[PDB]
Design a protein around this ligand. Sequence first.
Ligand SMILES: Cc1cc2nc3c(=O)[nH]c(=O)nc-3n(C[C@H](O)[C@H](O)[C@H](O)COP(=O)(O)OP(=O)(O)OC[C@H]3O[C@@H](n4cnc5c(N)ncnc54)[C@H](O)[C@@H]3O)c2cc1C
Length: 271
Amino acid sequence: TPAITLESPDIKYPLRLIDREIISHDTRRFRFALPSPQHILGLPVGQHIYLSARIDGNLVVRPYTPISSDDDKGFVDLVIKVYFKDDHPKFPAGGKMSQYLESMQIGDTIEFRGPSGLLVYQGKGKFAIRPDKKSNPIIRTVKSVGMIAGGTGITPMLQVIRAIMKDPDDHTVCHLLFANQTEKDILLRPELEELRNKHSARFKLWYTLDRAPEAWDYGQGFVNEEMIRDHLPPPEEEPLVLMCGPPPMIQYACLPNLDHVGHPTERCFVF
Ligand SMILES: Cc1cc2nc3c(=O)[nH]c(=O)nc-3n(C[C@H](O)[C@H](O)[C@H](O)COP(=O)(O)OP(=O)(O)OC[C@H]3O[C@@H](n4cnc5c(N)ncnc54)[C@H](O)[C@@H]3O)c2cc1C
């Protein structure tokens, strides 16, 4: 039983950045040292951490789901999309936290906190979902899990997929629908397609793209009722639907169409 990094959620833990990996122009894996090589992070599956820093005089807090797990000793890995300044004409200053991460030098610390979130995956189909931070968790056991992700919204889903996938006696089937703007913006694609090759009986993978390339075998356009009926488990299976992506996708593309297909609001969970 290893030592836990996040011992209480009311404490902020400054972790040293020990490595940087450039994945693409705007995507990067950051590795931080846990307090000892024999430490784990202490992050229930289904929950996330918060990074906090004072940037330009404002406290900035942002949630992140690590790519690493409590099976990893000594370190935590986050995969970060960097929103640069002077790139998108509508958002000229870029992203606050993600540019702060990009500017960190090896040996700089940044504050972690957690674990946080209203959902915990308790394993083999059992999800424990609190209706609010003070209410107690309601337990629902499901045969299948629908997953809609947009952008960096994949890491909450990856954490759950890998947690299922590595338990040979977990027969939960995950149906992922993964939306992004263009093909370069599909994050963690090598990983996702590796899980497809090795676990297709429990993992179904589909994509869509706002602006699809000419050679594209998957979805074109925003998530709709047809893709939800086609690439997510049917309501009659009483699945749980997990969601994480930009607020516009949740509000305009997911929630209304899940309702039209027939997914009850209690079985829909927005990270
Ligand atoms: C449960 C959960 C898990 C998450 N996990 C991850 C994770 O693993 N990795 C990760 O990177 N993020 C993750 N996110 C997203 C994260 O919380 C932040 O929203 C993200 O890092 C952007 O924050 P920011 O402060 O850098 O940008 P902000 O200053 O908060 O603004 C970001 C927003 O500004 C706009 N924007 C700014 N610059 C640009 C640009 N150049 N081009 C286009 N739009 C732009 C976009 O609307 C963008 O969404 C997660 C979120 C949640 C809720």
